[PDB]
Amino acid sequence: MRRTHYAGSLRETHVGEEVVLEGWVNRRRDLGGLIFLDLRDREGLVQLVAHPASPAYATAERVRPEWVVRAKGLVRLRPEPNPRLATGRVEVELSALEVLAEAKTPPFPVDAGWRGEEEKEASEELRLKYRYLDLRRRRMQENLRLRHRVIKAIWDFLDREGFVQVETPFLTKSTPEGARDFLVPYRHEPGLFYALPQSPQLFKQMLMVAGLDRYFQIARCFRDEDLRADRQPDFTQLDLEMSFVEVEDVLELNERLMAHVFREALGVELPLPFPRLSYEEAMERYGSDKPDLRFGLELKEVGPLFRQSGFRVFQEAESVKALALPKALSRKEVAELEEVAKRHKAQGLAWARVEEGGFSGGVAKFLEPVREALLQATEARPGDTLLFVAGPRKVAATALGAVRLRAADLLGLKREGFRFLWVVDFPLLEWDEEEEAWTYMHHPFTSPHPEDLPLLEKDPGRVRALAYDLVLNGVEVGGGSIRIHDPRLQARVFRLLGIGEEEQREKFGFFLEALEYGAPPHGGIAWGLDRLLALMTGSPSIREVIAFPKNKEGKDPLTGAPSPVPEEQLRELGLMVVRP
RNA sequence: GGAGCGGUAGUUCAGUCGGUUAGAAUACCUGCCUGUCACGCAGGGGGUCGCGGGUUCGAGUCCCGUCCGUUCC
């Protein structure tokens, strides 16, 4: 009655061995006077074989797919192997077969993948609602398990680097502004509430103030905000905080850590070190701070090439970003790339065709006079199409940049592999909001760069933060910064952000407080584990790497949540559903 | 939010441009088949055509309300 091998791991080496298996019937092939059964468990498919003489035979007939069975048999080498199966050179001669549980037909199949066939794609709304059957699939189990291997290596590694795993609160204090959080009613006192943690941010520093050196926690975060992109009401992060670290210290650890995670779960070997790029460079070269380095169609400023030009647009433009695509684009395509540009904020998207000795199309008239120079900058050959976005340096680049991304599609760029890169040197503050003060780019506890320090007052702009993103394939998978451990500095930083003692207390009260008892220099980084897994996995959604995610509206089909409650169960909490 | 788009066997869908017995494929079921591995062959069952009302000699098809899914902004 006890299995003796995972059905899917039997091998030539087991030939001759009496065996007992337990699993799911993948498919049956009843040749009549012979019956073959593809027995399955998390480790693979073995083929069971039944002969009329054996007591297994009778049961082997009525058995059906997704039926749970316990099979006792004898591993024998197959006359003619199944080259697509790991256990394909062998099979079991059922001494017995017993139904542990019958099963009705699945709303969708769950077997091709176990044979190595391109699993089909049941509608997401079907997989969600039967998630337990969806997880019988091979890709899901494979992801769910890549996940395990991944996290387990994060422990393995950080533990080895003396990081203390500390589990942080789940029930906290709703914060005044910013990220809307999920609230938990306090029964014992209507109107009072707990808050589901946006992240361990504060407790991780406290733990640093606490004398622990380096903490790490595969945290769980919540945020009641549009699951717009592939968001989930609540996700998972790798949260890591360190003391007596300078940015370099934090990056080098994460690099090496990442390295480990990959070599350990994907058996990939990311070359090191990851490359770095100032926000200034990422923005320029790609018009984005999460560069997709899988291919290079870099932007180029050419703003200067037109200061003598009569083409009003290019000359009276703060910036003119130039991107040349290796392809004469259709009017259709060019029109599409244009909506991208406008969708990011851009008055429009000039273009022109590069033919020998000149340009034709779009804006070629004015490119002509600067031809030679413009060719050297964009490295464009004849047959290429030049695309231009002109306007504010940022609008210019984020737009030409978006375009650059669609263009990778349009062009066909088979974007493969993994490209990691640190985006360092972001500015401490940023700006646009008709409410004219300086907004803190990242977090208010984000430490300015020691150099730029005298700049806080005289030039809030050129002040770089000691923050950094970790991006993979144009995806922000990590954020983080060195933090302010000196109350006075934090104080000076609050001055720029037009922040008073009022909001200061009411938002960071206990923490600025703690800063008074000897906070060490610290800072760390958080990894949005979900997206990191989607990417290592190839899933287009983080849902493929979450045992039971929610649908786009954050509703849970499988379970029927959210849901209503008894009128009195809510009353016990002292609240009332008000609207009408 | 805006529109489109879709809803018809268990699944995927077709039902042509209003009158074809609402069918295919696949799935399921039964029969036969002793080396199959997508076994094969034969046959069988399975339809609230999203719901409501409307247009019409005739509605799965068109109108409208409304519900649900889904895609680009």
Side-chain angles (χ1 to χ4, degrees):
Chain A
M1 186 210 328
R2 233 285 140 183
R3 84 160 65 88
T4 93
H5 296 84
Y6 274 119
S9 57
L10 273 329
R11 230 116 288 201
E12 295 98 77
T13 319
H14 301 75
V15 157
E17 286 184 64
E18 180 61 33
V19 144
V20 187
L21 299 210
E22 257 153 340
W24 291 257
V25 158
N26 210 41
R27 229 165 194 196
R28 51 177 321 237
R29 281 181 301 284
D30 197 314
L31 271 52
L34 219 63
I35 302 188
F36 295 106
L37 287 188
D38 268 355
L39 202 233
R40 181 240 317 172
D41 68 29
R42 57 129 75 156
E43 290 301 289
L45 309 184
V46 248
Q47 196 177 254
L48 310 184
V49 97
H51 308 278
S54 160
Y57 183 88
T59 307
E61 315 185 304
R62 81 186 196 72
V63 179
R64 287 297 184 276
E66 281 348 85
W67 269 37
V68 190
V69 299
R70 166 183 305 133
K72 310 196 195 183
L74 177 42
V75 203
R76 297 202 161 308
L77 210 176
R78 256 150 119 185
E80 306 183 59
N82 170 329
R84 293 134 302 160
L85 296 188
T87 51
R89 283 141 139 61
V90 298
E91 51 156 44
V92 214
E93 198 170 58
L94 294 176
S95 322
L97 196 63
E98 162 169 41
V99 185
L100 296 171
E102 301 183 6
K104 60 200 193 190
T105 303
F108 46 74
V110 288
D111 66 341
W114 291 106
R115 306 166 214 133
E117 299 169 26
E118 52 162 324
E119 227 132 29
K120 19 261 232 193
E121 287 185 359
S123 51
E124 253 230 346
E125 102 162 57
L126 243 169
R127 300 171 56 198
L128 250 53
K129 172 107 164 50
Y130 286 97
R131 195 51 167 216
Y132 45 93
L133 288 168
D134 175 33
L135 294 162
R136 292 195 174 169
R137 300 206 292 103
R138 203 184 183 191
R139 213 185 121 73
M140 297 322 261
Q141 305 204 350
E142 270 182 20
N143 301 168
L144 283 201
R145 288 215 191 172
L146 175 64
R147 180 130 183 175
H148 167 126
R149 263 180 278 110
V150 162
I151 278 177
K152 174 55 167 43
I154 287 183
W155 271 84
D156 275 34
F157 186 75
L158 291 176
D159 162 275
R160 198 191 81 265
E161 312 256 313
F163 273 70
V164 183
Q165 192 273 197
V166 178
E167 308 145 61
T168 263
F170 271 79
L171 289 172
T172 339
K173 186 190 201 171
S174 171
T175 37
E177 74 135 352
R180 182 196 287 92
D181 26 24
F182 286 102
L183 314 175
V184 182
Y186 190 56
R187 184 156 46 77
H188 296 131
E189 215 173 308
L192 265 128
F193 292 105
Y194 283 123
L196 291 176
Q198 217 73 44
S199 99
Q201 242 286 290
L202 288 185
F203 308 98
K204 61 187 291 187
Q205 317 202 58
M206 292 189 162
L207 269 347
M208 297 290 96
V209 162
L212 278 178
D213 193 24
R214 22 237 271 159
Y215 129 99
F216 92 77
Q217 114 163 284
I218 310 300
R220 186 64 96 87
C221 307
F222 306 61
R223 168 160 55 81
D224 186 348
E225 287 191 60
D226 61 351
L227 318 311
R228 280 307 87 252
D230 191 13
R231 307 294 189 44
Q232 282 286 314
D234 81 65
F235 52 114
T236 296
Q237 312 173 318
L238 165 78
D239 195 282
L240 158 161
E241 196 58 330
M242 283 171 77
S243 299
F244 309 119
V245 288
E246 242 181 332
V247 175
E248 192 67 25
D249 271 305
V250 205
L251 302 189
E252 182 274 358
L253 177 122
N254 274 292
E255 244 155 46
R256 286 163 57 249
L257 205 212
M258 198 52 101
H260 185 79
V261 182
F262 271 74
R263 182 176 12 175
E264 292 298 316
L266 296 189
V268 171
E269 279 257 6
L270 316 160
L272 257 15
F274 292 160
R276 305 129 115 86
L277 281 157
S278 61
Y279 167 81
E280 188 160 53
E281 253 184 290
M283 283 315 294
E284 278 302 71
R285 295 174 44 183
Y286 307 72
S288 151
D289 56 22
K290 23 175 186 59
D292 191 325
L293 306 198
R294 279 119 104 211
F295 73 93
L297 293 178
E298 293 182 36
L299 313 198
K300 305 283 190 185
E301 183 63 35
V302 268
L305 299 177
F306 306 91
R307 110 240 189 205
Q308 298 219 180
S309 161
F311 182 36
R312 296 260 270 103
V313 169
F314 285 14
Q315 193 251 16
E316 294 193 355
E318 173 180 357
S319 178
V320 198
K321 301 253 92 206
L323 164 58
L325 301 173
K327 168 171 194 292
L329 298 178
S330 81
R331 293 99 309 202
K332 241 281 188 180
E333 295 169 313
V334 174
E336 164 186 38
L337 288 190
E338 191 176 6
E339 147 102 294
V340 146
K342 299 172 168 288
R343 260 302 94 198
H344 282 74
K345 311 102 165 179
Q347 67 173 301
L349 194 224
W351 58 272
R353 300 200 187 73
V354 187
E355 320 269 49
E356 301 86 312
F359 322 97
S360 65
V363 69
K365 175 182 184 166
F366 325 94
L367 307 192
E368 198 49 62
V370 297
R371 174 157 51 72
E372 244 300 1
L374 184 53
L375 271 314
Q376 264 160 46
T378 84
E379 245 182 356
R381 291 170 131 169
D384 295 344
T385 313
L386 275 185
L387 258 27
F388 307 91
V389 174
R393 133 169 113 177
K394 212 178 73 56
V395 152
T398 44
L400 213 224
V403 171
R404 190 202 91 106
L405 278 181
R406 166 63 49 73
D409 284 330
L410 298 213
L411 266 95
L413 280 283
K414 304 303 151 187
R415 288 136 107 177
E416 287 323 316
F418 305 112
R419 305 311 282 302
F420 276 116
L421 88 164
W422 288 111
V423 167
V424 302
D425 296 322
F426 290 82
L428 185 64
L429 319 180
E430 52 161 38
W431 231 112
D432 64 78
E433 275 100 69
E434 74 81 72
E435 224 351 292
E436 341 168 85
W438 258 290
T439 291
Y440 49 121
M441 180 128 165
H442 301 124
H443 194 78
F445 289 132
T446 300
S447 176
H449 180 302
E451 288 184 82
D452 299 32
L453 223 27
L455 296 164
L456 261 54
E457 275 71 54
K458 50 203 302 182
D459 203 339
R462 193 84 105 171
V463 182
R464 52 246 179 73
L466 294 191
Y468 39 71
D469 277 28
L470 167 53
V471 344
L472 175 68
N473 302 332
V475 185
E476 197 211 281
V477 300
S481 48
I482 300 291
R483 348 271 185 182
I484 328 288
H485 62 328
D486 170 320
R488 298 193 178 171
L489 215 193
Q490 179 74 51
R492 216 214 297 203
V493 181
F494 270 104
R495 246 181 174 159
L496 270 309
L497 297 175
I499 297 185
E501 311 288 323
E502 199 65 285
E503 39 189 347
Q504 208 157 152
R505 292 21 197 186
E506 228 220 308
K507 260 240 122 205
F508 316 108
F510 47 97
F511 188 70
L512 293 329
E513 156 62 332
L515 260 149
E516 247 126 51
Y517 303 81
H522 69 302
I525 179 170
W527 289 12
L529 213 59
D530 306 301
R531 192 70 49 186
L532 174 286
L533 279 172
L535 306 204
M536 305 174 82
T537 230
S539 295
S541 176
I542 45 167
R543 303 196 204 87
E544 298 301 294
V545 290
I546 286 171
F548 299 88
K550 297 257 176 322
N551 70 37
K552 281 137 189 165
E553 304 173 74
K555 299 216 195 174
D556 168 8
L558 167 59
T559 235
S563 95
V565 277
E567 61 158 0
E568 233 59 20
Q569 201 212 317
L570 218 214
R571 185 189 191 194
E572 187 179 34
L573 285 168
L575 281 187
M576 180 170 269
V577 189
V578 308
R579 253 292 173 297

mmCIF file of all heavy atoms in Angstrom, chain A residues 18 108 166 204 263 269 395 403 521 535:
data_model
loop_
_atom_site.group_PDB
_atom_site.id
_atom_site.type_symbol
_atom_site.label_atom_id
_atom_site.label_comp_id
_atom_site.label_asym_id
_atom_site.label_seq_id
_atom_site.Cartn_x
_atom_site.Cartn_y
_atom_site.Cartn_z
ATOM 1 N N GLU A 18 10.390 -5.478 -8.508
ATOM 2 C CA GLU A 18 8.977 -5.607 -8.161
ATOM 3 C C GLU A 18 8.651 -4.184 -7.714
ATOM 4 O O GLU A 18 9.429 -3.561 -7.008
ATOM 5 C CB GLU A 18 8.833 -6.573 -7.001
ATOM 6 C CG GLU A 18 7.429 -6.812 -6.542
ATOM 7 C CD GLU A 18 6.578 -7.402 -7.629
ATOM 8 O OE1 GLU A 18 7.129 -8.169 -8.452
ATOM 9 O OE2 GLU A 18 5.360 -7.108 -7.655
ATOM 10 N N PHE A 108 -11.157 20.533 -18.589
ATOM 11 C CA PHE A 108 -10.099 20.732 -19.592
ATOM 12 C C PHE A 108 -9.078 19.623 -19.395
ATOM 13 O O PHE A 108 -9.004 19.041 -18.317
ATOM 14 C CB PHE A 108 -9.451 22.116 -19.474
ATOM 15 C CG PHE A 108 -9.107 22.519 -18.075
ATOM 16 C CD1 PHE A 108 -8.030 21.945 -17.412
ATOM 17 C CD2 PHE A 108 -9.859 23.494 -17.421
ATOM 18 C CE1 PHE A 108 -7.704 22.334 -16.126
ATOM 19 C CE2 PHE A 108 -9.537 23.895 -16.121
ATOM 20 C CZ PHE A 108 -8.457 23.312 -15.474
ATOM 21 N N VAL A 166 13.305 37.322 9.387
ATOM 22 C CA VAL A 166 12.416 37.810 10.405
ATOM 23 C C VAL A 166 11.081 38.052 9.773
ATOM 24 O O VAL A 166 10.966 38.754 8.780
ATOM 25 C CB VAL A 166 12.920 39.109 11.052
ATOM 26 C CG1 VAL A 166 11.898 39.585 12.068
ATOM 27 C CG2 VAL A 166 14.268 38.875 11.709
ATOM 28 N N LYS A 204 11.754 46.629 8.691
ATOM 29 C CA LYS A 204 13.074 46.137 8.281
ATOM 30 C C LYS A 204 14.196 47.042 8.755
ATOM 31 O O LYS A 204 15.306 46.577 9.044
ATOM 32 C CB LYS A 204 13.148 45.957 6.751
ATOM 33 C CG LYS A 204 12.936 47.219 5.920
ATOM 34 C CD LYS A 204 12.849 46.935 4.412
ATOM 35 C CE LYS A 204 14.184 46.482 3.820
ATOM 36 N NZ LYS A 204 14.124 46.366 2.325
ATOM 37 N N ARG A 263 21.458 29.808 -11.058
ATOM 38 C CA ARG A 263 22.241 28.599 -11.222
ATOM 39 C C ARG A 263 21.596 27.466 -10.447
ATOM 40 O O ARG A 263 21.711 26.304 -10.811
ATOM 41 C CB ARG A 263 23.646 28.882 -10.712
ATOM 42 C CG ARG A 263 24.678 27.783 -10.817
ATOM 43 C CD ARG A 263 25.992 28.369 -10.328
ATOM 44 N NE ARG A 263 25.745 29.654 -9.669
ATOM 45 C CZ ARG A 263 26.664 30.378 -9.044
ATOM 46 N NH1 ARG A 263 27.917 29.946 -8.987
ATOM 47 N NH2 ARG A 263 26.326 31.532 -8.472
ATOM 48 N N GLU A 269 23.572 30.442 -15.785
ATOM 49 C CA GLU A 269 24.723 31.060 -15.148
ATOM 50 C C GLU A 269 24.855 32.461 -15.670
ATOM 51 O O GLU A 269 25.491 32.683 -16.697
ATOM 52 C CB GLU A 269 25.987 30.281 -15.456
ATOM 53 C CG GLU A 269 26.161 29.056 -14.583
ATOM 54 C CD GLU A 269 27.190 29.253 -13.486
ATOM 55 O OE1 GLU A 269 27.706 30.383 -13.323
ATOM 56 O OE2 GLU A 269 27.482 28.263 -12.786
ATOM 57 N N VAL A 395 9.771 63.632 -22.252
ATOM 58 C CA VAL A 395 8.665 63.234 -23.090
ATOM 59 C C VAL A 395 9.295 62.669 -24.365
ATOM 60 O O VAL A 395 8.916 61.599 -24.844
ATOM 61 C CB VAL A 395 7.807 64.439 -23.430
ATOM 62 C CG1 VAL A 395 7.158 64.220 -24.731
ATOM 63 C CG2 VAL A 395 6.772 64.676 -22.350
ATOM 64 N N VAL A 403 8.067 53.529 -28.475
ATOM 65 C CA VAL A 403 8.129 53.198 -29.882
ATOM 66 C C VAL A 403 9.176 52.114 -30.091
ATOM 67 O O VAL A 403 8.912 51.078 -30.702
ATOM 68 C CB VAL A 403 8.508 54.451 -30.683
ATOM 69 C CG1 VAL A 403 8.785 54.093 -32.119
ATOM 70 C CG2 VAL A 403 7.384 55.469 -30.604
ATOM 71 N N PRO A 521 24.130 53.167 9.741
ATOM 72 C CA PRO A 521 23.873 53.491 8.339
ATOM 73 C C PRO A 521 23.339 52.195 7.717
ATOM 74 O O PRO A 521 23.932 51.120 7.889
ATOM 75 C CB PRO A 521 25.251 53.911 7.824
ATOM 76 C CG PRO A 521 26.194 53.043 8.623
ATOM 77 C CD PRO A 521 25.578 53.050 10.017
ATOM 78 N N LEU A 535 9.192 35.907 -15.224
ATOM 79 C CA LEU A 535 10.291 36.005 -16.172
ATOM 80 C C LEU A 535 11.219 34.797 -16.231
ATOM 81 O O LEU A 535 11.619 34.380 -17.317
ATOM 82 C CB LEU A 535 11.135 37.256 -15.916
ATOM 83 C CG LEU A 535 10.405 38.598 -15.870
ATOM 84 C CD1 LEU A 535 11.395 39.704 -16.205
ATOM 85 C CD2 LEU A 535 9.252 38.621 -16.862
#
